[PDB]
Design an enzyme around this catalytic site. Structure first.
Site, PDB file in Angstrom:
ATOM      1  N   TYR A   1       0.814  -1.096   0.047  1.00 30.45           N
ATOM      2  CA  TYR A   1       0.090  -0.122  -0.123  1.00 30.45           C
ATOM      3  C   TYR A   1       0.891   1.165  -0.025  1.00 30.45           C
ATOM      4  CZ  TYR A   1      -4.731   2.298   0.724  1.00 30.45           C
ATOM      5  OH  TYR A   1      -5.627   2.818   0.474  1.00 30.45           O
TER       6      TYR A   1
ATOM      7  N   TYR B   1      -3.662  -5.225   7.388  1.00 27.82           N
ATOM      8  CA  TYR B   1      -2.364  -4.275   6.882  1.00 27.82           C
ATOM      9  C   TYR B   1      -1.459  -4.268   8.002  1.00 27.82           C
ATOM     10  CZ  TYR B   1      -6.208  -1.833   4.329  1.00 27.82           C
ATOM     11  OH  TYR B   1      -7.267  -1.805   3.301  1.00 27.82           O
TER      12      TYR B   1
ATOM     13  N   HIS C   1     -13.121  -4.118   1.800  1.00 31.40           N
ATOM     14  CA  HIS C   1     -13.309  -4.217   3.287  1.00 31.40           C
ATOM     15  C   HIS C   1     -14.106  -5.692   3.571  1.00 31.40           C
ATOM     16  CE1 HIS C   1     -15.029  -3.909   7.435  1.00 31.40           C
ATOM     17  NE2 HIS C   1     -15.959  -4.283   6.919  1.00 31.40           N
TER      18      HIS C   1
ATOM     19  N   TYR D   1     -11.506  -2.671   7.373  1.00 28.63           N
ATOM     20  CA  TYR D   1     -10.768  -1.461   7.537  1.00 28.63           C
ATOM     21  C   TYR D   1     -11.171  -0.782   8.892  1.00 28.63           C
ATOM     22  CZ  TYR D   1     -11.345  -1.155   2.426  1.00 28.63           C
ATOM     23  OH  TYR D   1     -11.119  -1.146   0.864  1.00 28.63           O
TER      24      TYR D   1
ATOM     25  N   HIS E   1      -4.051  -0.714  -2.308  1.00 26.06           N
ATOM     26  CA  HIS E   1      -5.472   0.035  -2.283  1.00 26.06           C
ATOM     27  C   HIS E   1      -6.568  -0.371  -3.069  1.00 26.06           C
ATOM     28  CE1 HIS E   1      -3.253   1.007  -6.010  1.00 26.06           C
ATOM     29  NE2 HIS E   1      -4.482   1.435  -6.358  1.00 26.06           N
TER      30      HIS E   1
HETATM   31  N1  LIG Z   1     -11.240   8.001  11.408  1.00 28.39           N
HETATM   32  C1  LIG Z   1     -10.904   7.822  10.363  1.00 28.39           C
HETATM   33  C2  LIG Z   1     -10.749   7.222   8.890  1.00 28.39           C
HETATM   34  C3  LIG Z   1     -10.605   8.505   7.897  1.00 28.39           C
HETATM   35  C4  LIG Z   1     -10.483   7.775   6.570  1.00 28.39           C
HETATM   36  C5  LIG Z   1     -10.379   6.496   6.221  1.00 28.39           C
HETATM   37  C6  LIG Z   1     -10.444   5.609   7.453  1.00 28.39           C
HETATM   38  C7  LIG Z   1     -10.398   4.221   6.844  1.00 28.39           C
HETATM   39  C8  LIG Z   1      -8.991   3.544   7.052  1.00 28.39           C
HETATM   40  N2  LIG Z   1      -8.599   3.461   8.663  1.00 28.39           N
HETATM   41  S1  LIG Z   1      -7.194   4.350   9.036  1.00 28.39           S
HETATM   42  O1  LIG Z   1      -6.961   3.713  10.395  1.00 28.39           O
HETATM   43  O2  LIG Z   1      -6.280   3.830   8.067  1.00 28.39           O
HETATM   44  C9  LIG Z   1      -7.381   6.160   9.163  1.00 28.39           C
HETATM   45  C10 LIG Z   1      -7.072   6.732   8.150  1.00 28.39           C
HETATM   46  C11 LIG Z   1      -6.996   8.182   8.181  1.00 28.39           C
HETATM   47  F1  LIG Z   1      -7.090   8.809   7.156  1.00 28.39           F
HETATM   48  C12 LIG Z   1      -7.393   8.931   9.362  1.00 28.39           C
HETATM   49  C13 LIG Z   1      -7.270   8.040  10.519  1.00 28.39           C
HETATM   50  C14 LIG Z   1      -7.499   6.596  10.353  1.00 28.39           C
HETATM   51  C15 LIG Z   1      -7.696   8.545  11.753  1.00 28.39           C
HETATM   52  C16 LIG Z   1      -8.156  10.285  11.777  1.00 28.39           C
HETATM   53  N3  LIG Z   1      -7.154  10.681  10.588  1.00 28.39           N
HETATM   54  C17 LIG Z   1      -7.356  10.133   9.294  1.00 28.39           C
HETATM   55  C18 LIG Z   1      -8.728   2.321   6.612  1.00 28.39           C
HETATM   56  O3  LIG Z   1      -8.583   1.363   7.308  1.00 28.39           O
HETATM   57  N4  LIG Z   1      -8.880   2.208   5.037  1.00 28.39           N
HETATM   58  C19 LIG Z   1      -9.162   3.423   4.341  1.00 28.39           C
HETATM   59  C20 LIG Z   1      -8.060   2.738   3.095  1.00 28.39           C
HETATM   60  C21 LIG Z   1      -8.576   1.480   2.983  1.00 28.39           C
HETATM   61  C22 LIG Z   1      -8.535   0.755   4.417  1.00 28.39           C
HETATM   62  C23 LIG Z   1     -10.804   6.059   8.656  1.00 28.39           C
HETATM   63  C1  LIG Z   2      -9.267   1.158  -0.747  1.00 27.05           C
HETATM   64  S1  LIG Z   2     -10.721   1.406  -2.149  1.00 27.05           S
HETATM   65  C2  LIG Z   2     -10.774  -0.605  -2.632  1.00 27.05           C
HETATM   66  C3  LIG Z   2     -10.894  -0.852  -4.117  1.00 27.05           C
HETATM   67  C4  LIG Z   2     -12.187  -0.322  -4.660  1.00 27.05           C
HETATM   68  N1  LIG Z   2     -13.178  -1.061  -4.346  1.00 27.05           N
HETATM   69  C5  LIG Z   2     -11.742   0.044  -6.358  1.00 27.05           C
HETATM   70  O1  LIG Z   2     -12.321  -0.353  -6.965  1.00 27.05           O
HETATM   71  O2  LIG Z   2     -10.882   0.860  -6.576  1.00 27.05           O
HETATM   72  C6  LIG Z   2     -11.918   1.508  -0.993  1.00 27.05           C
HETATM   73  C7  LIG Z   2     -13.260   1.841  -1.603  1.00 27.05           C
HETATM   74  O3  LIG Z   2     -13.957   0.638  -2.166  1.00 27.05           O
HETATM   75  C8  LIG Z   2     -15.073   0.529  -1.574  1.00 27.05           C
HETATM   76  N2  LIG Z   2     -15.405  -0.415  -0.704  1.00 27.05           N
HETATM   77  C9  LIG Z   2     -14.378  -1.247  -0.323  1.00 27.05           C
HETATM   78  N3  LIG Z   2     -14.871  -2.376   0.610  1.00 27.05           N
HETATM   79  C10 LIG Z   2     -16.469  -2.111   0.387  1.00 27.05           C
HETATM   80  C11 LIG Z   2     -17.414  -3.033   0.747  1.00 27.05           C
HETATM   81  N4  LIG Z   2     -17.288  -4.119   1.431  1.00 27.05           N
HETATM   82  N5  LIG Z   2     -18.728  -2.726   0.385  1.00 27.05           N
HETATM   83  C12 LIG Z   2     -18.992  -1.659  -0.611  1.00 27.05           C
HETATM   84  N6  LIG Z   2     -17.901  -0.876  -1.083  1.00 27.05           N
HETATM   85  C13 LIG Z   2     -16.618  -1.020  -0.630  1.00 27.05           C
HETATM   86  C14 LIG Z   2     -15.652   1.973  -1.282  1.00 27.05           C
HETATM   87  O4  LIG Z   2     -15.892   2.620  -2.440  1.00 27.05           O
HETATM   88  C15 LIG Z   2     -14.329   2.451  -0.737  1.00 27.05           C
HETATM   89  O5  LIG Z   2     -14.379   3.879  -0.786  1.00 27.05           O
END
Ligand SMILES: N#Cc1cccc(C[C@@H](NS(=O)(=O)c2cc(F)c3c(c2)CCNC3)C(=O)N2CCCC2)c1
Ligand SMILES: C[S@@+](CC[C@H](N)C(=O)[O-])C[C@H]1O[C@@H](n2cnc3c(N)ncnc32)[C@H](O)[C@@H]1O
Ligand SMILES: N#Cc1cccc(C[C@@H](NS(=O)(=O)c2cc(F)c3c(c2)CCNC3)C(=O)N2CCCC2)c1
Ligand SMILES: C[S@@+](CC[C@H](N)C(=O)[O-])C[C@H]1O[C@@H](n2cnc3c(N)ncnc32)[C@H](O)[C@@H]1O
Lengths: 245, 245
Positions: free
Chosen positions: B130, B190, B182, B220, B178
């Protein structure tokens, strides 16, 4: 008076005034469970629980805790298992565990009893304790493998076991970790735990938020495995949806 | 000649003869991926990859590795992202990742693309990276939250993001972490990763054995959440079988 808090990695802690010699010895020492509220308060000698009465940590002021005894006469002491003795009070339940889990028929077909959440909890919550007799890996490996349903590795030297008849709650319920069934989609893990009654053991800790009355499951550590596990693995593998080319 | 191996917590390593000054500088230094076989071999300066050619770690004798170059002309260098620049070769894929994962339509309904295993792997296997632009938490929190679909926290200070247009593989495919969707029953997590091209980033690592063509999913980190996540959570909760009293 000067108070010391010793936190274990699992979130539990020993708290009290150290004596002139620096030892955790006295009549007002406590172990506090990972919820930072449930406590065993009373007589300890060199950090060892002699008479811990069930209590609640109500508040702290500049490091000094205030405990209030719970109603009843629940009391506990350090009672580490041996290779042959599981407990000197096998039917005395753990108070923290009793608030969080119960035993009932597993939702997995033909899998006997399972372990269930009594209440809703968040992720990373300690739910249950895996105590049992302490035997060597060499002893487990060399004996009949039909005896090894409840053998959980503690470390490189030691295995924790709940042998017959202690695998039945009518004979042993001081801890209930050995009632959690296996799943390939588990909602819990085994983790290390330092317990004031049981010593160094393992616990069951959630991997996600869990609602009340969900079954608690862990992925068992096989990596030969029991036939039920081989069967379930093949079935799990066949069940998984796949991308088709 | 005296060789040093520096292993990162993630299982990857930097290996080579240190120079007179003790720096990892020379023409025969390598980064080796966590499989202990795939390597980027060539010119490094103070541990930084200048010209790493795709290679295989064939053997080691008393600490001294033997590398053989792979066919083709795959070559890589340290290319850390900024807040504004994701990569200076956005469409050059990672060779380790390319052997282990691919992008296709997610098996989750209406969830866009997902990430899939190309091959069978055991538990705790690094599958994907990532990488993305590096922005502050403060910047993420203050801006429109519709921009935060791909924002993954790296540490207390830094968030890794894959903003438009780089969320499409036709514009960015140097890493693919990315693309993992989820799930509340994930098969990956991660984890931290120290990458020779991307710098300190995160990776996707399996939680169990995974077969080929399974979708790779992670739980997530929400703990406000996006509406799709709120909806899926309520649906997951309703789906769970419970003990009935
Ligand atoms: N709060 C929050 C938050 C904000 C944006 C996105 C997320 C989800 C993020 N959770 S995070 O722990 O990485 C995270 C991502 C964040 F950008 C932020 C926070 C936490 C804390 C608040 N400041 C921003 C996560 O697991 N992701 C997004 C990309 C695919 C999986 C969480
Ligand atoms: C890190 S990207 C995952 C890849 C994305 N699906 C793509 O096509 O690029 C995160 C985005 O995927 C979608 N997503 C991830 N998990 C999902 C789930 N379980 N159900 C619906 N949408 C999901 C949401 O639009 C989210 O903002
Ligand atoms: N190998 C093995 C093995 C032997 C017996 C039981 C198990 C399963 C055990 N896996 S283990 O990692 O704790 C384990 C338990 C063991 F007893 C042993 C080993 C490993 C290594 C070999 N020596 C014995 C487990 O997760 N359990 C059993 C109780 C409920 C969950 C594994
Ligand atoms: C640690 S005990 C779990 C509690 C046990 N079911 C009981 O009633 O005491 C492990 C034993 O439970 C059974 N078991 C655990 N998970 C199972 C599963 N997924 N399917 C079938 N049997 C399972 C097997 O008999 C195994 O030896």
């Amino acid at each position: 008076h000067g108070v010391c808090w010793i936190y274990y990695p699992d979130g539990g802690s020993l708290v009290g005034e150290v004596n002139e010699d620096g030892e955790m010895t006295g009549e007002k020492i406590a172990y506090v469970y990972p919820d930072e509220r449930t406590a065993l308060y009373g007589k300890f000698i060199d950090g060892e629980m002699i008479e811990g009465k069930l209590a609640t940590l109500m508040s702290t002021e500049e490091g000094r805790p205030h405990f209030e005894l719970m109603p009843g006469n629940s009391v506990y002491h350090f009672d580490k298992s041996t290779s042959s003795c599981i407990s000197t009070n096998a039917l005395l339940p753990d108070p923290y565990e009793s608030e969080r889990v119960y035993v009932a028929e597993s939702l997995i077909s033909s899998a006997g009893e399972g372990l269930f959440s009594k209440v809703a909890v968040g992720p990373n919550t300690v739910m249950s304790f895996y105590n049992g007799v302490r035997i060597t890996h060499q002893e487990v490996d060399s004996r009949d493998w039909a005896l090894n349903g409840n053998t959980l590795s503690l470390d490189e030297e030691t295995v924790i076991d709940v042998p017959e008849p202690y695998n039945h709650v009518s004979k042993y319920c001081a801890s209930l970790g050995h009632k959690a069934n296996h799943s390939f989609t588990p909602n819990c893990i085994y983790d290390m735990f330092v317990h004031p009654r049981f010593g160094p053991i393992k616990c069951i800790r959630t991997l996600r938020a869990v609602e009340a009355d969900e079954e608690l499951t862990v992925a068992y550590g096989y990596d030969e495995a029991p036939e039920w596990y081989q069967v379930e693995l093949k079935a799990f593998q066949a069940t998984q949806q796949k991308h088709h080319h």
